[PDB]
Design an enzyme around this catalytic site. Structure first.
Site, PDB file in Angstrom:
ATOM      1  N   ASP A  25       0.817  -1.207   0.000  1.00  0.00           N
ATOM      2  CA  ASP A  25       0.000   0.000   0.000  1.00  0.00           C
ATOM      3  C   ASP A  25       0.854   1.263   0.000  1.00  0.00           C
ATOM      4  O   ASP A  25       1.261   1.756   1.056  1.00  0.00           O
ATOM      5  CB  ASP A  25      -0.946  -0.018   1.197  1.00  0.00           C
ATOM      6  CG  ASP A  25      -1.960   1.089   1.152  1.00  0.00           C
ATOM      7  OD1 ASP A  25      -1.862   1.947   0.251  1.00  0.00           O
ATOM      8  OD2 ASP A  25      -2.868   1.109   2.016  1.00  0.00           O
ATOM      9  N   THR A  26       1.031   1.840  -1.187  1.00  0.00           N
ATOM     10  CA  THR A  26       1.759   3.097  -1.326  1.00  0.00           C
ATOM     11  C   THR A  26       1.052   4.280  -0.676  1.00  0.00           C
ATOM     12  O   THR A  26       1.672   5.333  -0.503  1.00  0.00           O
ATOM     13  CB  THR A  26       1.990   3.426  -2.802  1.00  0.00           C
ATOM     14  OG1 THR A  26       0.730   3.573  -3.485  1.00  0.00           O
ATOM     15  CG2 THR A  26       2.759   2.342  -3.470  1.00  0.00           C
ATOM     16  N   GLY A  27      -0.228   4.154  -0.357  1.00  0.00           N
ATOM     17  CA  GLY A  27      -0.937   5.202   0.334  1.00  0.00           C
ATOM     18  C   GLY A  27      -0.819   5.171   1.846  1.00  0.00           C
ATOM     19  O   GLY A  27      -1.385   6.037   2.519  1.00  0.00           O
TER      20      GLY A  27
HETATM   21  C1  YUM Z   1     -14.769  -6.157   5.036  1.00  0.00           C
HETATM   22  C2  YUM Z   1     -14.339  -4.678   4.998  1.00  0.00           C
HETATM   23  N1  YUM Z   1     -13.309  -4.121   4.167  1.00  0.00           N
HETATM   24  C3  YUM Z   1     -13.223  -2.592   4.444  1.00  0.00           C
HETATM   25  C4  YUM Z   1     -12.230  -1.593   3.777  1.00  0.00           C
HETATM   26  O1  YUM Z   1     -10.964  -2.052   4.217  1.00  0.00           O
HETATM   27  C5  YUM Z   1      -9.801  -1.341   3.867  1.00  0.00           C
HETATM   28  C6  YUM Z   1      -9.022  -1.715   2.603  1.00  0.00           C
HETATM   29  C7  YUM Z   1      -7.743  -0.949   2.263  1.00  0.00           C
HETATM   30  C8  YUM Z   1      -7.268   0.187   3.211  1.00  0.00           C
HETATM   31  C9  YUM Z   1      -5.987   0.995   2.883  1.00  0.00           C
HETATM   32  C10 YUM Z   1      -6.394   2.429   2.551  1.00  0.00           C
HETATM   33  N2  YUM Z   1      -7.318   2.341   1.441  1.00  0.00           N
HETATM   34  C11 YUM Z   1      -8.680   2.969   1.424  1.00  0.00           C
HETATM   35  O2  YUM Z   1      -9.163   3.574   2.357  1.00  0.00           O
HETATM   36  O3  YUM Z   1      -9.403   2.770   0.201  1.00  0.00           O
HETATM   37  C12 YUM Z   1     -10.828   3.021   0.269  1.00  0.00           C
HETATM   38  C13 YUM Z   1     -11.036   3.764  -1.130  1.00  0.00           C
HETATM   39  O4  YUM Z   1     -11.056   2.477  -2.082  1.00  0.00           O
HETATM   40  C14 YUM Z   1     -11.608   1.442  -1.364  1.00  0.00           C
HETATM   41  O5  YUM Z   1     -10.927   0.328  -1.424  1.00  0.00           O
HETATM   42  C15 YUM Z   1     -10.247   0.017   0.012  1.00  0.00           C
HETATM   43  C16 YUM Z   1     -11.033   0.906   1.004  1.00  0.00           C
HETATM   44  C17 YUM Z   1     -11.589   1.882   0.245  1.00  0.00           C
HETATM   45  C18 YUM Z   1      -5.184   3.262   2.057  1.00  0.00           C
HETATM   46  O6  YUM Z   1      -4.592   2.571   1.019  1.00  0.00           O
HETATM   47  C19 YUM Z   1      -4.251   3.494   3.232  1.00  0.00           C
HETATM   48  N3  YUM Z   1      -4.922   4.540   4.130  1.00  0.00           N
HETATM   49  C20 YUM Z   1      -4.449   5.954   4.165  1.00  0.00           C
HETATM   50  C21 YUM Z   1      -5.137   6.763   3.002  1.00  0.00           C
HETATM   51  C22 YUM Z   1      -6.637   6.855   3.149  1.00  0.00           C
HETATM   52  C23 YUM Z   1      -4.502   8.199   2.973  1.00  0.00           C
HETATM   53  S1  YUM Z   1      -5.399   3.919   5.659  1.00  0.00           S
HETATM   54  O7  YUM Z   1      -5.694   2.485   5.553  1.00  0.00           O
HETATM   55  O8  YUM Z   1      -6.470   4.757   6.180  1.00  0.00           O
HETATM   56  C24 YUM Z   1      -3.971   4.149   6.707  1.00  0.00           C
HETATM   57  C25 YUM Z   1      -3.942   5.285   7.684  1.00  0.00           C
HETATM   58  C26 YUM Z   1      -2.709   5.429   8.529  1.00  0.00           C
HETATM   59  C27 YUM Z   1      -1.562   4.425   8.382  1.00  0.00           C
HETATM   60  C28 YUM Z   1      -0.279   4.632   9.262  1.00  0.00           C
HETATM   61  C29 YUM Z   1      -0.657   5.258  10.591  1.00  0.00           C
HETATM   62  O9  YUM Z   1       0.457   5.459   8.438  1.00  0.00           O
HETATM   63  C30 YUM Z   1      -1.612   3.317   7.375  1.00  0.00           C
HETATM   64  C31 YUM Z   1      -2.832   3.168   6.522  1.00  0.00           C
HETATM   65  C32 YUM Z   1      -8.053   0.535   4.485  1.00  0.00           C
HETATM   66  C33 YUM Z   1      -9.316  -0.211   4.818  1.00  0.00           C
HETATM   67  C34 YUM Z   1     -14.193  -2.268   5.454  1.00  0.00           C
HETATM   68  S2  YUM Z   1     -14.925  -3.548   5.830  1.00  0.00           S
END
Ligand code: YUM
Lengths: 99, 99
Positions: A25-27
């Site tokens: 996860d690059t994000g």
């Molecule tokens: C059965 C169920 N599955 C779910 C959904 O589960 C997921 C799946 C993937 C992710 C990863 C997340 N992607 C995401 O939000 O994408 C959403 C948009 O596209 C969809 O696809 C996936 C979700 C939807 C980001 O890539 C990474 N984020 C940051 C960015 C937002 C800036 S972070 O995770 O917040 C985070 C915060 C702080 C830190 C440390 C502290 O630095 C590390 C990570 C998170 C939850 C709910 S229930």
């Protein structure tokens, strides 16, 4: 290898003697893993994204192997819906984005 | 280009005729931008992130330029903490992960 993004970039990792699936996860600045009872000292933290914050436990200097590439650094453990390998470890395995 | 991950992979995007900054996010299925005015019809949708589920506005078939590379796809608009470019558009511009 080369990982296309047609589907979630899920890979196999090894942490605390256990195999798991995790997202490259690059994000993510840092690495967040599903609840697991790791040994050692930890500090509580709150981390946020879409939908708000979750509480996690920060463990330092944890070894993770990612598709055979060893990495060591900080892992956050708590009720994340998915195992997330963030940039703190992606850099260590030589991972780049290319387009 | 080749993008290393020692820093956040932020890029300039062009959407609705306006420039913005956004994060290349391989952990996102979908592209989600912060509250902004966009032209066209939209439908209410829900999406889930690390912290839970939020209400968003779903705009389909939207033109968006990412570091010059053109994409036409779905853009979700709502209370994301960060503008994120997800896999629906990263695939369009030919992005892969490599290590
Ligand atoms: C059965 C169920 N599955 C779910 C959904 O589960 C997921 C799946 C993937 C992710 C990863 C997340 N992607 C995401 O939000 O994408 C959403 C948009 O596209 C969809 O696809 C996936 C979700 C939807 C980001 O890539 C990474 N984020 C940051 C960015 C937002 C800036 S972070 O995770 O917040 C985070 C915060 C702080 C830190 C440390 C502290 O630095 C590390 C990570 C998170 C939850 C709910 S229930």
């Amino acid at each position: 290898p080369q990982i296309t993004l047609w589907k979630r970039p899920l890979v196999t990792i090894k942490i605390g003697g256990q195999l798991k699936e995790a997202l490259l996860d690059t994000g993510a600045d840092d690495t967040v893993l599903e609840e697991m009872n790791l040994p050692g000292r930890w500090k509580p933290k709150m981390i946020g994204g879409i939908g708000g914050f979750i509480k996690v436990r920060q463990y330092d200097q944890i070894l993770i192997e990612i598709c055979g590439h060893k990495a060591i650094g900080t892992v956050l453990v708590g009720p994340t819906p998915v195992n997330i390998i963030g940039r703190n470890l992606l850099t260590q395995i030589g991972c780049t984005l290319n387009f």
